[PDB]
C-alpha cells in the first residue's frame, strides 16, 4: 500500500515502542502463524518448530530486525529490501498468501502486548506498512 | 472444530463484553479497510478514525454482528446452516465482496488480543482462526 506521512510517523512511533522486544515479538508471531496456519510450516522443513525452539527464536529476531530496517527506510523500501526480495521471491517462491498470514500474526502479537499503543489509526498504518513490505518481498524487480 | 476448539471458543466468549468488542471490531474494520465505509453511509460521518470509533450507529451495529457470532457458537458444527440467510442478505441485497468477511474476522481476532493480552495465547488464537475461517466460509456459501 502507499503510505501517507501520517502512516510513516505512526509506524515509526509504534515500532519504536516495540523497541528491545522486537525479537521477542517476531518469534511469537512466527509461533502464532505456525499453529494457526499449519501450511506455512512447509517452508521450514529443516526447523524445529516446537514451542521455545532455538531456531524459531533466532528466526524471529531476524524477521524483527528486518522490519526495524524497513521502518528506517520507509521512503525507499524496494531498494532497502532488494536482497530480502531476492530470497523470498526468487529463491523460496513464497506464495503471497503467507505474507498476509504472518502480517496478521504480527498485528495480533502487537495487540496482545501493546494494547494502549495499538490504536485503530496505528493498526491501520501498521497494516499498510506490512502490506507494503509484503509487496516488495513478493516482487521480482 | 476439535472438541478443544469448541471449549476454547465457548470459554473465551463467556468473558467477552459483546457491546465493547462489537463496536471496537466494526470500528476497526472501517478504519483499517476504509472501502468498507461505503456499505455504512447511512451511519453518518465516517471521514476520520476518531469519527468512526465514536459513532453510535457503528457501535450499535457492531454489537449486532458480534451477537450473531455469539449465537452461532451454540451451533459450531452447523455454521453453514446458521448463516445461510445472512449469506443471502450480504450477497444479494448488500453486495459485500466475500473477501471482506475474512477481514472482519481478522479484526475480531486482533480485538480479542487487545482485550485478553497474554491470555490470548497462540493456542487460543488457533481455535479462533478456525472460528473466523468457518464464519467467513458460511457467509460466503450462498455466493
Ligand atoms: C514481513 C515479512 C517477512 C520478513 C521481514 C522476513 C524476513 C526474513 C529474513 C530477515 C530472513 C533471513 C534472510 C537471510 O538470512 O538472508 C528470512 C528468511 C526466511 N523466510 Fe522470511 N520474512 C518474512 C516473511 C516470510 C514468510 C511469510 C515466509 C513463509 C511462510 C518466510 C519464509 C522464510 C524462510 C523459509 C526463510 C529461510 C529460513 C532459514 O533457512 O533459516 N518469510 N526472512
Ligand atoms: C463475521 C462477519 C459478519 C457477520 C456475522 C455479519 C452479521 C450481520 C448482521 C447480523 C446483520 C443484521 C441483519 C438484520 O438486521 O437482519 C448485518 C447487516 C449488515 N451487514 Fe454484516 N456481518 C458480517 C460481515 C459484514 C461485512 C464484512 C460487511 C461490509 C464490509 C457487512 C455489511 C453489512 C451491512 C451494510 C448491513 C446492513 C446494515 C444496516 O444498514 O442496517 N457485514 N450483518
Numbering used by the authors:
A (entry chain B): 1 to 141
B (entry chain G): 3 to 145
What do the authors report?
The HbF mutant harbors substitutions of three positive lysine residues on the surface of the α-subunit into negatively charged glutamic acid, combined with an asparagine residue substituted for aspartate. The mutation sites are spread out across the surface of the alpha chain at α11 (A9) Lys→Glu, α56 (E5) Lys→Glu [Hb Shaare Zedek], α78 (EF7) Asn→Asp [Hb J-Singa], and α90 (FG2) Lys→Glu (Hb Sudbury). The 3D structure of the rHbFα4 mutant was solved with X-ray crystallography at 1.6 Å resolution. The overall structure of the mutant HbF crystal was found to be very similar to the wt rHbF and the mutations did not appear to cause any apparent structural perturbations. The structure confirms that the mutation sites are located as expected from the initial design idea, and the negatively charged side-chains are positioned on the protein surface as intended. A closer inspection of the electron densities of each of the residues in the α-subunit revealed that two residues in close proximities to the mutation sites differed between the wt rHbF and the mutant rHbFα4. The charged side-chains of αD75 (EF4) and αH89 (F10) had altered directions in the HbFα4 crystal structure compared to wt HbF. These residues are not in direct contact with heme nor any redox-active residues. The difference in charge distribution coming from the mutation sites α78 and α90 may have had an impact on the charged residues of αD75 in the EF corner and αH89 at the end of helix F, as the side-chains of these residues appeared to be able to align differently in the rHbFα4 crystal structure. The oxygen binding study showed that the mutations in the rHbFα4 mutant did not affect the oxygen affinity or the cooperativity of the wt HbF protein.
